[PDB]
């Protein structure tokens, strides 16, 4: 996260760290959506251009964390994966269209002050809140600048950007399964996700029922926090029929 701040304790209790077993290293962010299901970006698990194709046994999820590198005894909980599900039309060949994956845990995680699921949006909440200018919140342990790493979880609030501005900022083909967020060069304020924040959540607090909803997944960007560029996020509601099919069948 570029130009963010340290998270408060318990500020993002749905935050999940995707952790490689050997070598032990951070792979990605992710989010807790129930006691047994974790949401992330497909490219965190499968990206053939970089020879990335993880299996369940390669990976752990660490839930309840604040510190990036510490083992947070009596606070964090570490879970093994039962099964990975990648969207069948995830487009890793071109533009990361439908950049979404689910991970089912081997055993349910115990909720606590530090561990709690985020809501997924209904159609009405998505329609009301996914508007240009409305701000969401992105969290992660990724790079603090494009070209080190944070001591603790980072947080930045960013406005959703008009779709023509998103399209005109890049040569990559945008789709309806994406939205972009960030400040414009004139707006003064800054901030973005960066490498290592992949798969983490873009959340919004509904003013109707005061619950946090996950509207997006950190997907891609060209650099980090560049003027005239914007971060791109998987449009969670657009893919919710696939989410519900996986969870209902598995």
């Amino acid at each position: 996260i570029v130009e963010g701040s340290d998270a408060e304790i318990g500020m993002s209790p749905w935050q999940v760290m995707l952790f490689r077993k050997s070598p032990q290293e951070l792979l990605c962010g992710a989010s807790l959506i129930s006691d047994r299901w974790v949401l992330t970006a497909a490219h965190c698990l499968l990206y053939p251009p970089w020879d990335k194709n993880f299996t369940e046994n390669d990976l752990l999820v660490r839930i309840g964390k604040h510190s990036r590198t510490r083992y947070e005894r009596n606070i964090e909980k570490i879970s093994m994966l039962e099964k990975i599900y990648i969207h069948p039309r995830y487009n890793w060949r071109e533009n990361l269209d439908r950049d979404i994956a689910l991970m089912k845990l081997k055993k349910p995680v115990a909720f606590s002050d530090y561990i709690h699921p985020v809501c997924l949006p209904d159609r009405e909440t998505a329609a009301s809140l996914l508007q240009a200018g409305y701000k969401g919140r992105v969290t992660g342990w990724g790079n603090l600048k494009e070209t080190g790493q944070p001591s603790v979880l980072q947080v930045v609030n960013l406005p959703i950007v008009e779709r023509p501005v998103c399209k005109d900022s890049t040569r990559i083909r945008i789709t309806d399964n994406m939205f972009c967020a960030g400040y414009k060069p004139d707006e003064g304020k800054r901030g973005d996700a960066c490498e290592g924040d992949s798969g983490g959540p873009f959340v919004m607090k509904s003013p109707f029922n005061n619950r946090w909803y996950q509207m997006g997944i950190v997907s891609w960007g060209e650099g980090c926090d560049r003027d005239g560029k914007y971060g791109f996020y998987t449009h969670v509601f657009r893919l919710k029929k696939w989410i519900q099919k996986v969870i209902d069948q598995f």
Binding site: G10, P117, V118, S206
Partner: peptide, 27 residues
């Protein structure tokens, strides 16, 4: 059911330091 309500914030009616920035944008 309980989703999206944080034990250390919404469940105790405490606000975090920047959530107001989000609310103010929802015009």
């Amino acid at each position: 059911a309980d989703c999206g309500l944080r034990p250390l914030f919404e469940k105790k009616s405490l606000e975090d330091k920047t959530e107001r920035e989000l609310l103010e944008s929802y015009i």
